[PDB]
Structure formats: C-alpha cells, structure tokens
Design a binder for this molecule. Sequence first.
Ligand code: NA
Length: 198
Amino acid sequence: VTDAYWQILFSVLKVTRNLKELDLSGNSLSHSAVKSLCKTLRRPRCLLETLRLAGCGLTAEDCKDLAFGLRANQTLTELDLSFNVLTDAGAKHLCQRLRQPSCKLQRLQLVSCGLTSDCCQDLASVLSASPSLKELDLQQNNLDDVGVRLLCEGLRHPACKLIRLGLDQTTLSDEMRQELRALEQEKPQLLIFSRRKP
Ligand code: NA
C-alpha cells in the first residue's frame, strides 16, 4: 500500500466527523504513513479516543513520531501497539510522553513488543505519575525479576491508579511471585492477569 494512498487516507480522516476509533491493525505502515498519522493526531479537532496499530510493522523510530504527535492530545484513551518490534527504545520514547501530566491515557497495550527489564524504569515512571492510566498490558514480553521489581515500585506508589496489569509470571522467581501476591493486599483493586497462565 503506497505512500500517496496513505497521504490521502489521513487527509480524509481530518474531514470526517465523529470518527472516534481508528483501527489500522494488520496494515504495514511505512514511515511515510506513520508521519501522516501523526498529523491527523495533531489537528485540534481529532475526535479519536481509540487508535489500534497492532501488527503494523512499527519500529522504535515510529514511537518517537507517535509520542510527538500526541503532546497536544488529551482525547485519546486507548492505544494498542501490540505485535510490533518496538524494543525498549521505542517504549522509552512513549514513556516520556505518557509520563506527562498533560497525557491522560487510560488503556495501553504493549503485548509482544520485544520489551525487556530495561524499559521497566520508564514504565514505573509512568505508573507513578500518570493521571489516568488504568490498564497496562505487558504480556508476551521478556521481563525478569530485575524489571518486575522496578514495576512494583511504581505500583506501590500512592499516586498509581492501575486496576489491570497484564503480566506473564512464567519465569519469575517464587520470591518475585510472592512480592506480586503481597501487592494484591497493599493495592486491593489492582488485578494482575495473564492469558498465558491456566
Ligand atoms: Na501521565
């Protein structure tokens, strides 16, 4: 799918009304496509509350353009970036924006994005300073005890507001698992799920 097409597609979006959910999952988005989309997100009338970019071929550099295009947006509440090789570098660009008080995302999914323990400090930073984040899906990533313990510091922060955290506990030490279960009692309304655990 060619750049000229994308360019015209995102121009059609700016002039259609009460379009509140954009779902491009499955479409490979070139870097030209990703920059165009950053423009439709930076028009002040962007009525978009849900943006789904799962399995689109996004890379770390696309996260920079994405976080930049959302600096002046306070309407978007769902973002799906699952199934893109974003790496901890991509996740870092995103966190710098999610951590802003101006950003009020509620649901973020980063399922299967190639994240490791390296990004958990930037994630915990979001956890302990986000005014509206209620759902963070980190399933199907390679987080170990190093990373999860940094997440727990963000979870225990009295400002943290998460109610659902998708997190695979497959390779965590039993010490780690116990820390996670103790946190069910310090934060009674946080649910820690995993479709990968029976
Ligand atoms: Na925030």
